[PDB]
Design goal:
monomeric, two-stranded antiparallel sheet, Death-associated protein kinase 1, death-associated protein kinase, alpha+beta, 31% helix, 280 residues, 9 strands, 17% strand, 2 domains, transferase
């Protein structure tokens, strides 16, 4: 699929740079015709088929296709797509409250109420995605943005669908791999992947929200990955002594090696606690 090839600068003015990645940079922008604000994500294209630099056309189109399907309050929305010789530019909904990663870095740790307030939104967004057979595959605090961080109960949106895939045949088997600290054992072992991988990531996020510590983090990527594959984690008393048994139960049912025995997104919403790259 081809995208708009007019110069994006003729329709938008850019400003503050929100984030910078390995193959993408995001900048705040304003549409000239409406004055409405957005986030422009510039994704670097590959210059040759055998090039390691840039993102393949296939991978860019997958992200765009998935974003176009989604429409939910807890998921970033896509407005337009432009492209030129060097980049594909996604004009996305602007979320300027910062990363949940940054929010957590300031509060150190959250109360169960604060954690569940965030989790309920993440679960609702993932429920929507999984209902459409969409696996995100890169869930972590950095990919959860707040709309406004200056309110007692910040609302969020899931972002960065760069690894997202449609799981129409139950699983995907193509070496999909995210950040070591958050990937499920099946990812570490290069096995078929499904929606279950996202649930494991949610368990890791929940552990972090409640303790300010990462469950499988080692001193090197290989150590972290080895820890993940062996499900080498513990609810350290220093961090969890005053955490409810139900919260631990919730995490324990997500950090399960066998994907088939792991809680599904529907299970997570009915759980009593809720129910109202890889190489160094």
């Amino acid at each position: 699929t081809v995208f708009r090839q007019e110069n994006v600068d003729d329709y938008y003015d850019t400003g503050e740079e929100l984030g910078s990645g390995q193959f993408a940079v995001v900048k705040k922008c304003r549409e000239k015709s409406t004055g409405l604000q957005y986030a422009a994500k510039f994704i670097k294209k590959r210059r040759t088929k055998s090039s390691r630099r840039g993102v393949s056309r296939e991978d860019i189109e997958r992200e765009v296709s998935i974003l176009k399907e989604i429409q939910h309050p807890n998921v970033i929305t896509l407005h337009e797509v432009y492209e030129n010789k060097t980049d594909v530019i996604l004009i996305l909904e602007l979320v300027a409250g910062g990363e949940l990663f940054d929010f957590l870095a300031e509060k150190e740790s959250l109360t169960e109420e604060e954690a569940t307030e965030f989790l309920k939104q993440i679960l609702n967004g993932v429920y929507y995605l999984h209902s459409l057979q969409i696996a995100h595959f890169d869930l972590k605090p950095e990919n959860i943005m707040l709309l406004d961080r200056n309110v007692p109960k910040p609302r969020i949106k899931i972002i960065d669908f760069g690894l997202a895939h449609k799981i129409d045949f139950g699983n995907e088997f193509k070496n999909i791999f995210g950040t070591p600290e958050f990937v499920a054992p099946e990812i570490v072992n290069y096995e078929p992947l499904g929606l279950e991988a996202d649930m494991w990531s949610i368990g890791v996020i929940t552990y972090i929200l409640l303790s300010g510590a990462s469950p499988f983090l080692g001193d090197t990527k290989q150590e972290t990955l080895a820890n993940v594959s062996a499900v080498n984690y513990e609810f350290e008393d220093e961090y969890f002594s005053n955490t409810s048994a139900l919260a631990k139960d919730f995490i324990r049912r997500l950090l399960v090696k066998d994907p088939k025995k792991r809680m599904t997104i529907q299970d997570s919403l009915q759980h009593p606690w809720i129910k109202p790259p890889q190489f160094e």
